[PDB]
Structures are given as structure tokens and as C-alpha cells.
Amino acid sequence: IIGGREVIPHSRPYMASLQRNGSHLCGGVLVHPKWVLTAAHCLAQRMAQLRLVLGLHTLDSPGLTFHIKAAIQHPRYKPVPALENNLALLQLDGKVKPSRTIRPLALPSKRQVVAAGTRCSMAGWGLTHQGGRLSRVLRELDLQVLDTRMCNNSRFWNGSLSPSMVCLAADSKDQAPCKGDSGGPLVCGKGRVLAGVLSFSSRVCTDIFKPPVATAVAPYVSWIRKVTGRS
């Protein structure tokens, strides 16, 4: 996150760091005692070298670490250049006992609409400057949902955003998520309800003509339920 603020430690206990060889790769959200939901493109890796670490604030600390038993990419995930259905479910090799620093975030009803103008936030350990370095501490940025049609404008995302995609803007031009922040959760409203998982932007993270976009969670709720084994 560029221009973001350090979270009160452990105020977002549903946060996961997906890590390759002990180095932060993507955010994730714990949505069941045994499953973290993250971005599908984050899994273009040697699974053997990946871990999920829960209950963190400083990246430089143990936190509670899990091996991954399975990585279930949405059945219709389409990689870049499409980047359609960009979600993956990761099964922990253990079961979270909910505490004060580690607990799942509830899924939204499947009938949730992320309307334009909705006030949200997101958190991550992603880069704090263009071409810089990971944040050392968990951070947050407030974001508002933009109108998708306007976001699909030729000078913006060029007709390329689908109805399952949530288009985002910070309050100022120099605030944006950046490399490391994808997979992280977009939570919206007074109830800080799960509404999105961050996906992509442009190569320049603060590019105002290429605003950050998250995958909407609601349309995927029934697949998440099937996969994690409820209904």
C-alpha cells in the first residue's frame, strides 16, 4: 500500500500473508477455520515453497504458520491478459482456533451488491512506493467504489471490466495498493463486511487512469461454500 496507514496491531485478525520461502507474496483472507481466500494469479508458484502465516502485524515475526494442502483456483480462472475469475481457495494443513489475533471473516450473502459510492477499506503488506519494498507492518487504505461504466471508459480500463469486478479509488491521487496487496480483502460499510478480494491495476500503482480493481465476493459465495464444505 502506497500512502496508507499502519493498522492498530491485530485489528484485522482475518488477514493472511501468503509467503514463498519466508518472503511475503500476496494477501489473503481467512473465510473458514481451514481456508484462506486469495487471488488466483498468486499461485503461479512451486506450492512446496509456499506457506500461509496468520496473526501477523510485522512481517518480521513468527505469527502462526500453515502448510497448504490444496489450492483450488476458480474453475473458470483465466490468466492475464483476461484475468477473469481471479480467486483461489487455499486449504490449511490444520484448523484455526479463533482467538483475538486470528479469526475468520464472514462471507457476505450471495445477494450483496457493491454499489458505486460504497465506502470500503483494504489492508496489506504490499509495496509502499513504486518499485520499492514491502511494508514492514500491516497497512490499510480507505477506498470508494467507482462506477464500472466510467471505469470502463476508453481512457480508463477500456471496456475491460466485467460485472464481477469492483473498481476502486482512494481519496487522493498518490494512494493505492501496490505489488504484494493482491489477494487481500476489500471490506465495506459500517459493518466492515467482506466484499472483495483485490486483483490488479496497472504497472504504475498510482496511475489514475488505471484504478485498482477487486473481484466481487458475492457472486462467488456459493462456490466458496461448496469448496470449504458448508452451505
Binding site: 507474496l25 501496490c178 500503482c205
Partner: peptide, 7 residues
């Protein structure tokens, strides 16, 4: 064209 995962 230019989607870049926050990878």
C-alpha cells in the same frame, strides 16, 4: 493489454 496483477 495492461492488466498487472497486484501479484
Amino acid at each position: 493489454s495492461g492488466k498487472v496483477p497486484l501479484s
